[PDB]
Write a protein that binds this ligand. Structure first.
Ligand SMILES: [Zn+2]
Length: 257
């Protein structure tokens, strides 16, 4: 099965998922000088006041915080988007060292980690149908750098010891994802894909310019997670990022000048 190792990592994914070599794959390098300011882009609307988290799960490739998306309660709209997109989960990608971990890069710079808040277009009724559409998902990407702690992340960090290995899950209620956002909602946007198999080309990417800061101790706890299942040889869950893919026929637009 696919993963992030030498024999099953990103360079292998195309064998099971040929769209890996497609025309709108993610992530990409964001060349900030070539990104075009688009005055027609609207401010992003992030309405997370009623978000309701349900569970946290180690799926063998990341940990997902999964939300109750059965009502209109945590929505992303505006920006480049037409209509309303509902939050279903978030997860991170991170490195074995602070110098790598992000999937998107900015002028080739890698951040220590990257948060993905995954939303589906309500016009398609649920997530499974949305991923089959070219405008099915909107993923809000936020870079993490190591410095001061992010207090709003600590509740996540502190449950990780209970989901150390693949397949483990725990109840995880009342987590407020507003605590993971930076001050500014200035962003870049482009059309792309899921960055994990099945790599479907269904995502409008919205990548915030301002990173959040997390502490070294916080990211060190991410690195204690395992790719393997319980009672298997320990392989730390680190470097679970796909590298930048060819931009091909795409333009990255900036909401800011
Ligand atoms: Zn992701």
């Amino acid at each position: 099965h696919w993963g992030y190792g030498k024999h099953n990592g990103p360079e292998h994914w195309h064998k099971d998922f040929p769209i890996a070599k497609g025309e709108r794959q993610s992530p990409v390098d964001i060349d900030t000088h070539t990104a075009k300011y688009d005055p027609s882009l609207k401010p992003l609307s992030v309405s997370y006041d009623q978000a309701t988290s349900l569970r946290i799960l180690n799926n063998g490739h990341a940990f997902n915080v999964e939300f109750d998306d059965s009502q209109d309660k945590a929505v992303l709209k505006g920006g480049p988007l037409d209509g309303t997109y509902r939050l279903i989960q978030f997860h991170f990608h991170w490195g074995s060292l602070d110098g790598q971990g992000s999937e998107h890069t900015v002028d080739k710079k890698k951040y220590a980690a990257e948060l993905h808040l995954v939303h589906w277009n309500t016009k398609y009724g649920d997530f499974g149908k949305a991923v089959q559409q070219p405008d099915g998902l909107a993923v809000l990407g936020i870079f993490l750098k190591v410095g001061s702690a992010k207090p709003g992340l600590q509740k996540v960090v502190d449950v990780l010891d209970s989901i150390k290995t693949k397949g483990k899950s725990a109840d995880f209620t009342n987590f407020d994802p507003r605590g993971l956002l930076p001050e500014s909602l200035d962003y870049w946007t482009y059309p792309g894909s899921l960055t994990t198999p099945p790599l479907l080309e269904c995502v409008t990417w919205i990548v915030l310019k301002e990173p959040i800061s997390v502490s070294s101790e916080q990211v060190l706890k991410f690195r204690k997670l395992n790719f393997n299942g319980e009672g298997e040889p320990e392989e730390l869950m680190v470097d679970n990022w796909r590298p930048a893919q060819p931009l091909k026929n795409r333009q990255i637009k900036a909401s800011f000048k």
